[PDB]
Design a protein around this nucleic acid. Structure first.
Lengths: 122, 46, 159, 98, 146, 62, 59
RNA sequence: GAGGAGGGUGGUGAUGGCGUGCCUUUUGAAGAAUGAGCCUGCGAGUCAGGGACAUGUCGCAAGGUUAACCCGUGUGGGGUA
RNA sequence: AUGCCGUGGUGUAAAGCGUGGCAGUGAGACGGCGGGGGAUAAGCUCCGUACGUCGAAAGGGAAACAGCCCAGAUCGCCGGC
RNA sequence: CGCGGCACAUCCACCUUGUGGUGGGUGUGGGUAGGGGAGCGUCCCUCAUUCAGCGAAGCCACCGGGUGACCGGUGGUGGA
């Protein structure tokens, strides 16, 4: 019973290549070189989605800091004040507010300033 | 009939094909070494 | 069958020495990996038969036939002849008028006058003597037909 | 508009705002209320429990569209280790009305 | 998600810093963030955002003689030797604009946008700046709170 | 085609009526002047195979 | 009365005795507050494990 | 439905972030340790034996089982050494 | 001082013992702590720890970094501490 | 930690209550050598059944599906 092992292998070849399309040079043409890249690419996606989440926090923080400085207040005391106020609002939508409605951001700043106690002593 | 004829459950254990990738059993497959055992069987006596 | 190293003609020469050639360590011209090479772990011409207990054989057979009796698939006919000569046409009318099924097993015995001649040329119809009543034919065929002598012989041999 | 708290996440939504959310016990045509985090009508800024435990975001669940198919497999190095798998997050669609 | 990234959605304003008594480092930092746009909420590191920054009176930047006579500047050419060692004091007496430029560039990232940002920098040693056709905005340094 | 039994094992080990194998001790065939009767009694008799090599010995006999 | 034992640091460099001590305190993850009875035998386990857990009197 | 705002597929991708080929052998590798130019095809743990050990299921039940061999037509019925 | 054997309670999910089946390992490294060999030496070599890590563990930090610090990735999330 | 989707042990109440499964809870799930368990796929014989020159196989492109090996539909080529 000779089986002619071409077909079964071709399923892998055409699948991996059609997914690997777009890669430069001997990456989107060669099965055995493409296969390497899918391994590296997918390990990269695996860690990059998580890093992406952290990255977006970094961006949101920077923008909040910018608007906060426009209202003459730091990010530190901003978050401290909002926590004291119980305003459990995430940094994503807070940074959104910074653009959609800067006045609302100013209002939240006044709330934080009022909620903050007096100084840096305890 | 034959189309309703079935083997007993628990019998007919599939043959563990050995040298067919890492997910099946392995590249070295049992003989995970480089010494005598990797290449030939030492007499049980020795 | 197949062909392993040693049956392949030649191959005793060891060309492409191990220094100054830049080629792999060939060592023989008919190794498996070479075009026209031998077959490793090939299908050697096995001659085998899964010997089983006679009690398993008999139990399985009487089990299958007993299920046919439970479903009314046993047609213990008396004979099939126009006197002495065969008549396949009449066999068709008889079998397809009482059974009305595709695959049929016929048990007659050692009578070649109108035994395995009238039932021949009937797709799905197989015929055998009581002594050779296997199970594969029984499970393949539905309306198992017996002669009176088939029942007497089978029962007598099987108490 | 208002920020709705649901699925462990927060989303900015307004009236008539279609947004993808996580899987929850619902069907097709049921208005399930959801808590709020912040309501901003352009001047009013809410903050505390007097608003948070007072108002909600009522919306209909109509969609049940599956997320993108993520194919993934891990690979370490010369160790000789691969882990083939995948995941397709089951989501729902929220039509925000309040 | 983000709203700021978009072709043409940038306000290219002009800022002027009277760099007389200010220290080099603090000036360079404020210029760097102000130049990149981190003082704005529409930050988008992927694009060449930010405003234009003008340095005025760079000649008068206060730097101690303890560094004028010791903080050496090195421009290696590529040839054997060719380590163009020159004092920062002499650079202050020849091309102080290049000193300030160097300090800012050392605080900017090292990437393609950094060069697109560099070409948005205009530094003149003197106080009299012909560029008055645009809208200069005097900008001073400050702390915020805390 | 058919198994062989190690002749030394068949000449040194004795299977009992159950799943046990015993070993004859006889470190007493060379010099017997310095050995006390205590030691020769320790060697005298027949001792069950220690469980640390029965998985080998049973295959050596069979 | 009762104590709330909350693990703060992990069990990576912790040796066998410390790891088993935490197993006997019923701790499985970092923030896993466990309510323990009177100090019949907890004093030793805590004193052995002080740098990995937080001792907080609780009801 | 032209052209376009907005929305969503399929390409391309400015620009930023992150990130040291695969296999083997190694205490240890991205390799300046080795091997592969690429593609297609071929190819490496299989079988006989009334073998041995252990285990799971299936026949029987202090029993079980037939080898060689005979008859016959498929491989079934007999055969007690 | 620690550590070892045994004993009475408390606590704990599987950790232990015995008997069988089937293999691997049988070249280790580093760091910390005690030593010896050496030159009061070495990224040297040889010992012990129920001391750990790597080996066989990705991630964050040490600028870069298998062995140091924190911490043991089922998958997803444009959510937090 | 939170919110959803898979899985492995143990446990609670059930249906054929150790054969085999249903609802729920807790804990667990990095892993080479190596053990064990459960599967996909090409070819071939047989049985039941069946599309099939009103166009199969093979091949190509697209759109979809499955936790994965992989699978389906559409269209084109081809013609058993």
């Amino acid at each position: 019973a000779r089986v002619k092992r071409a077909v079964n292998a071709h399923k892998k070849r055409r699948s991996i290549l059609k997914a690997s399309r777009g890669y430069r040079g001997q990456r989107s043409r060669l099965y055995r070189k493409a296969k390497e890249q899918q391994l590296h690419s997918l390990n990269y996606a695996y860690r990059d989605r998580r890093a992406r989440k952290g990255e977006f926090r970094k961006l949101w923080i920077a923008r909040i800091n910018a608007a906060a400085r426009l209202n003459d207040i730091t990010y530190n005391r901003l978050i401290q004040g909002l926590k004291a106020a119980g305003v459990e609002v995430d940094r994503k939508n807070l940074a959104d507010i910074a653009i959609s409605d800067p006045a609302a951001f100013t209002a939240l700043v006044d709330v934080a300033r009022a909620a903050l106690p007096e100084d840096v002593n305890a | 009939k034959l189309h309703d004829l079935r083997p007993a459950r628990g019998s007919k254990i599939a043959r563990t094909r050995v040298g067919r990738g890492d997910g099946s059993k392995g590249k070295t497959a049992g003989r995970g070494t480089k010494g005598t055992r990797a290449r030939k069987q030492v007499p049980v006596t020795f | 069958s197949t062909k392993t190293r040693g049956e392949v003609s030649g191959g005793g020469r060891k060309p492409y020495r191990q220094k100054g050639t830049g080629r792999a360590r060939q060592g023989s011209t008919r190794a498996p990996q070479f075009t026209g090479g031998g077959v490793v772990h090939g299908p050697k011409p096995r001659d085998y038969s899964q010997r089983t207990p006679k009690k398993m054989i008999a139990a399985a057979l009487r089990g299958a036939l007993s299920d046919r009796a439970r479903n009314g698939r046993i047609h213990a006919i008396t004979e099939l002849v126009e006197g002495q000569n065969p008549s396949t046409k009449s066999a068709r009318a008889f079998l397809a008028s009482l059974t009305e099924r595709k695959q049929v097993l016929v048990v007659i015995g050692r009578s070649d006058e109108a035994g395995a001649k009238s039932v021949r040329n009937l797709p799905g119809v197989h015929i055998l003597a009581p002594d050779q009543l296997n199970t594969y034919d029984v499970l393949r065929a539905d309306d198992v037909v017996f002669s009176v002598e088939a029942l007497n012989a089978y029962i007598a041999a099987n108490t | 508009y208002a920020i709705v708290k649901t699925g462990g996440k927060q989303y900015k939504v307004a009236v008539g705002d279609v947004v993808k959310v996580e899987k929850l016990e619902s069907e097709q045509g049921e208005k399930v209320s959801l808590p709020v985090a912040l309501v901003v009508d352009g001047a009013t800024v809410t903050t505390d429990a007097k608003a948070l435990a007072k108002v909600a975001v009522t919306g209909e669940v109509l969609g049940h569209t599956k997320g993108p198919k993520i194919r993934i497999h891990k690979f370490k190095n010369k160790t000789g280790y691969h882990k083939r798998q995948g995941h397709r997050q089951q989501l729902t669609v929220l039509k925000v009305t309040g | 998600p983000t709203y700021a990234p978009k072709a043409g959605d940038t306000t290219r304003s002009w800022y002027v810093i009277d760099a007389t008594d200010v220290v080099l480092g603090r000036l360079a930092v404020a210029a760097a963030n102000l130049l990149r746009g981190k003082h704005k909420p529409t930050f988008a590191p992927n694009v060449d955002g930010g405003d234009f920054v003008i340095v005025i009176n760079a000649d008068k930047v206060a730097i101690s003689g303890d560094k004028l006579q010791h903080k050496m500047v090195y421009r290696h050419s590529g040839y054997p030797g060719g380590l163009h060692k020159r004092t920062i004091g002499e650079l202050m007496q020849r091309h102080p604009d290049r000193v300030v430029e160097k300090a800012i560039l050392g605080m900017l990232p090292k990437n393609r946008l950094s060069r697109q940002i560099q070409r948005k920098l205009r530094v003149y040693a003197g106080p009299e700046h012909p560029h008055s056709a645009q809208q200069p905005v005097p900008y001073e340094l400050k702390q915020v709170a805390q | 085609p058919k198994a062989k039994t190690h002749s030394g094992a068949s000449k040194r080990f004795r299977r009992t009526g159950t799943g046990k194998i015993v070993r004859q001790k006889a470190n007493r065939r060379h010099l017997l002047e310095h050995k006390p009767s205590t030691r020769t009694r320790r060697l005298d008799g027949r001792t069950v195979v220690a469980a640390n090599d029965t998985k080998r010995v049973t295959s050596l006999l069979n | 009365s009762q104590l709330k034992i909350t693990q703060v640091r992990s069990t990576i460099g912790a040796r066998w005795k410390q790891r088993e001590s935490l197993r006997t305190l019923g701790l499985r993850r970092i923030r896993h507050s466990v309510i323990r009875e009177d100090n019949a035998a907890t004093r030793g386990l805590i004193a052995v494990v002080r740098h990995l857990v937080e001792v907080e009197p609780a009801q």
